[PDB]
């Protein structure tokens, strides 16, 4: 079973996290795709996906994901299991915390993808997020700006969860 992890990054934090996620899964189970360089239609090449995106400029997708968002309408994610992760800043942007993964999950689910890897809100403080579904985040949310001391344990916990939900 091959997992494709597709990310965008401006300041490198989501990329750093992507690499830890890859390591934590082990071997060559996860292949990384930076959408500054990767073709978006490679999303079709996997039945198991991990979508990484930080939120920028008070509620916007990271620029690589923003530029490719319209192309999601052309893809069929039916039959795929999709997980999400984001980096964000809950102190600076409490009204838009992790919006970007929420935006992406809404569209990918509309295009047939099935979300796995929902994540508790416990231990975050924010006002609003477009990433909430029935009181859980759509996926792992990291905050390297305020909570960098929690990132490693959070990733370990989530990868264990994903191994179960993906049926590895
Ligand atoms: C100008 C600016 C705007 C930001 N806007 C948001 C936001 O709306 N929501 C959020 O959750 N985080 C926001 N952040 C936090 C970034 O998402 C966070 O620093 C993230 O780790 C950046 O990921 P990257 O290094 O992969 O680009 C913002 C950061 C900056 C500096």
Swiss-Prot record:
The keyword Metal-binding does not apply. Its cofactor is FMN. Keywords: Electron transport, Flavoprotein, FMN, Transport. PROSITE patterns: FLAVODOXIN, FLAVODOXIN_LIKE. Residues 3-163 form the Flavodoxin-like domain. One of its GO terms (molecular function) is electron transfer activity. InterPro entries: Flavodoxin, Flavodoxin/NO_synth, Flavodoxin_CS, Flavodoxin_lc, Flavoprotein-like_sf. Gene3D superfamilies: 3.40.50.360. This is Flavodoxin. It comes from Nostoc sp. (strain ATCC 29151 / PCC 7119). The gene is isiB.
């Amino acid at each position: 079973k091959k997992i494709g992890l597709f990310y965008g990054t401006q300041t490198g934090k989501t990329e750093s996290v992507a690499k830890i996620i890859r390591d934590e899964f082990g071997g060559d189970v996860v292949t990384l795709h930076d959408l500054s360089q990767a073709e978006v239609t490679k999303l079709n090449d996997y039945e198991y996906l991990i979508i990484g995106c930080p939120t920028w400029n008070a509620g916007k997708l990271q620029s690589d994901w923003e530029g490719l968002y319209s192309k999601l309408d052309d893809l069929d994610f039916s039959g795929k299991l999709v997980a999400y992760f984001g980096t964000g800043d809950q102190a600076g942007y409490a009204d838009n915390f992790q919006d970007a993964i929420g935006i992406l999950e809404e569209k990918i689910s509309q295009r047939g993808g099935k979300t796995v890897g929902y994540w508790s809100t416990d231990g975050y403080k924010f006002n609003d997020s477009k990433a909430l579904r029935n009181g859980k985040f759509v996926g792992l949310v990291l905050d390297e700006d305020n909570q960098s001391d929690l990132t490693k344990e959070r990733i370990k916990t989530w990868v264990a969860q994903l191994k179960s939900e993906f049926g590895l």
